[PDB]
Specification:
mainly beta, Immunoglobulin-like, 3-stranded antiparallel beta sheet, globular, immune system, immunoglobulin fold, monomeric, mite allergen Der f II
């Protein structure tokens, strides 16, 4: 279930899995269909708030989905304890209007009171029906 990702913070992300995806094989995102991704990370700070932002980049265009709950504290027990490990299961869903692509990079970022909590990049994404 684990998928290959590139860290873009300081390695607090230990592993990330996304429904129906494996290693470095194409990870298909179906438009309008709920995409569920799970990330296991180590809190690099003590913080009472946590925000999670997911963005997709494709052929010179970057997209995000408005109208989704970005308060990570609705998915894990906050405040977060530095050094302690957390497992967040977040459901994302790209609208049908999103253009299709065979080259999409997905970045998952968590932000805390004192800055970036975690950052990971999945480079084998594909948006299709």
């Amino acid at each position: 279930d684990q998928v290959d990702v590139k860290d873009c913070a300081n390695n607090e992300i230990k592993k990330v899995m996304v429904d129906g995806c494996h290693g470095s094989d194409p990870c298909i995102i179906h438009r309008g269909k709920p995409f569920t991704l799970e990330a296991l990370f180590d809190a690099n700070q003590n913080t009472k708030t946590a925000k999670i932002e997911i963005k997709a980049s494709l052929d010179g265009l970057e997209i995000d989905v408005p109208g989704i709950d970005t308060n990570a504290c609705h998915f894990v027990k906050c405040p977060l304890v530095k050094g302690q490990q957390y497992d967040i299961k977040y459901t994302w869903n790209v609208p049908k209007i999103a253009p299709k692509s065979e080259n999409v990079v997905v970045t998952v970022k968590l932000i805390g009171d004192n800055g970036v909590l975690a950052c990971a990049i999945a480079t084998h994404g594909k948006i299709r029906d």
